[PDB]
Design a protein around this nucleic acid. Structure first.
Lengths: 93, 93
DNA sequence: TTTAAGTTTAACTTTCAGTTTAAC
DNA sequence: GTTAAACTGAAAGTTAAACTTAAA
């Protein structure tokens, strides 16, 4: 339905500390994408649960992270869109 | 760069109270899209500033709302993408 | 004087595991 | 005698409000 420029998105995220760290949390010590529950993310970055959780929620809405039911809770991984956004940043650095 | 299905997004937002109300806040009494600062939104919906603000920020990242500098602060309006998402909901109702 | 936004703390609503007791 | 359920002991998460810092 709608075409998306991945460079603008990455540009926007880069200008917003919380979005940026929420995104990068899913990338591990060896550069590999990983699974995380909401609590892990909030613990990993130094921002409050409300901030981090709301960001996680919106990023799943945006389709940047995936949600999958696991136990009676949920886990988050970067979507293919998520991984592509992360790539723009890696190239900068 | 990336194609987007507007129905899935709307589906995701509809399953998340905060995202949904943050989005609809921009639609006024007469059905018209309107401008809002971050404070207006948080005051309008009954959720905490941290939740609402983080959601606003991520929605601008996603390209659902636009940011424009005004005074030395910012204001938010739905993008064309934002308006299209709102339309799916209007059709449901 | 009404200034706005963000962060932290407190309160309220919907925590998990182990042990003991009761019922089949 | 074994299994299941409930209660108690060692509760967690989210949202809202208030205060402080950067104030117009």
């Amino acid at each position: 339905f709608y075409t998306l420029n991945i460079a603008e998105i990455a540009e926007r995220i880069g200008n917003d500390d919380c979005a940026y760290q929420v995104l990068m949390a899913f990338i591990n010590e060896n550069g590999e994408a990983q699974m995380l529950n909401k609590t892990a993310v909030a613990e990993m970055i130094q921002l409050s649960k409300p901030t981090v959780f709301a960001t996680v929620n919106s990023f799943y809405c945006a389709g940047y992270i995936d949600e999958t039911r696991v136990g009676r809770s949920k886990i988050y991984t970067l979507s293919d869109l998520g991984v592509e956004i992360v790539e723009c940043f890696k190239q900068k650095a």
